[PDB]
Amino acid sequence: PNITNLCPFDEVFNATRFASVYAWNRKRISNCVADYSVLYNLAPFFTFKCYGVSPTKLNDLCFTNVYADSFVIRGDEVRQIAPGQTGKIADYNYKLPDDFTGCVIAWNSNNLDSKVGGNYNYLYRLFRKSNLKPFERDISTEIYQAGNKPCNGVAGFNCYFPLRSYSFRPTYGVGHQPYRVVVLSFELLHAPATVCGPKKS
């Protein structure tokens, strides 16, 4: 009757490498007890932004399904992860619906992500024909054209590559620091419980 076990939060939060913005990886958590106390240790002076659950009383609540989304974005752009925002990274790479019942965690990570030589391994899309529906992922790298002439796999004027590259460096101001973001989504009171913290009889 008791789910016991342990939720793999340490694997999600402390993974060696996180995905890029346009190819954010989704992970599912189930059949374990969630201890939302190690969370406060990571980014302790940084604030959890939760959107429908009080972060203090989150321990005593059972969730039907928990999904974790991880990526790496620039500093000042983190404010775009909130629901209802508009911008380049909130409309061309990753958008949240305006019904989001979850909580987002962000912390400056300019100790292992960025390098003095410059980190070009993180990419982001810049050009799209139209908007993207909430919680969508596109990896296709077909060349996007805005003029009249068709693009037969070419570059230059009036024909651009949709993927641009972040250029992270140590001695940059807050805003150009690589921020690692993990957002947790879970809905309430609509299905049998699968994951939650301590509970007795």
């Epitope: 002076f45 003095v116 101001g173």
Partner: antibody, heavy 120, light 111 residues
Framework: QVQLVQSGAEVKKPGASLKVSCRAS????????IHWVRQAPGQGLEWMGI???????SYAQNFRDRVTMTTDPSTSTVYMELGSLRSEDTAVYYC??????????????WGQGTLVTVSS | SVLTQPPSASGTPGQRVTIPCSGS????????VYWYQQLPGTAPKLLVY???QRPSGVPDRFSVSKSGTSASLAISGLRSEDEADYYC?????????????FGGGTKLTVL
């Protein structure tokens, strides 16, 4: 046998460019970062940049846009050049080693020091 | 120079003297604090790193403590061989930029 050797310099003129080299020996050169610092006479200390022994570099905001410094893993020498000097930049320049990871340094070796004077 | 130090300090031999380095959350709150000593006419050296340990070839006479958002270097058993300036260093991340902010440098005198 760890040391960071430099070369002396003489007076300059405003608007010119000055170049100094830091040479290391006795240890694996392509393993440790390099830090640059400047100390005005009768004043404190302020550092300039961090460098891979073979690669790029990063510079502080105050001393950006006018410093250029490359790598040369042939004689284990790293050169730095400052352009558009001014009479307020007269100081002593030091090069220091660092821990291989950096980002939390312990500047144990330091350079002899180059005196830079800018007067007309 | 966000780091704040007293420009001058003095003490009699055998007296415990404390040199403070008071910073902020960005520079002293998150990262380590390193203490360097510069004799006149010589390049700076290393005295204390990591708030606990010291390099080889350095006596255990100097002690370091860190509290809140500030640090202190106490020199028990002061002697005549401590006529040098003391600098505190800590990586600082700010809205404008980021780097190794240093201190003004305290000129310590022995009577």
């Amino acid at each position: 046998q760890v040391q960071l050797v430099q070369s002396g310099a003489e007076v300059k003129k405003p608007g010119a460019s000055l170049k100094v080299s830091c040479r290391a020996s006795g240890y694996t050169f392509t393993s440790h970062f390099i830090h640059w610092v400047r100390q005005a006479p009768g004043q404190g200390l302020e550092w300039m940049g961090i460098i891979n022994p073979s690669g790029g570099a990063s510079y502080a905001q105050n001393f950006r846009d006018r410093v250029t410094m490359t790598t040369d893993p042939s004689t284990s020498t790293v050169y730095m050049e400052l352009g558009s000097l001014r009479s307020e930049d007269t100081a002593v320049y030091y090069c220091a080693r660092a821990e291989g990871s950096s980002w939390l340094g312990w500047f144990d070796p330091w350079g002899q020091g180059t005196l830079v004077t800018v007067s007309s | 120079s966000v780091l704040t130090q007293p420009p001058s300090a003095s003490g009699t031999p055998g007296q415990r003297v404390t040199i403070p380095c008071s910073g902020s959350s960005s520079n002293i709150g998150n990262n380590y604090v390193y203490w360097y000593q510069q004799l006149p006419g010589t390049a700076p050296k290393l005295l204390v790193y990591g708030n606990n340990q010291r390099p080889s070839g350095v006596p255990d006479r100097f002690s370091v403590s860190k509290s809140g958002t500030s640090a202190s270097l106490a020199i028990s058993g002061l002697r005549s061989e401590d006529e040098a300036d003391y600098y505190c260093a800590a990586w600082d991340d700010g809205l404008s930029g980021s780097g190794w902010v240093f201190g003004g440098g305290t000129k310590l005198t022995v009577l």
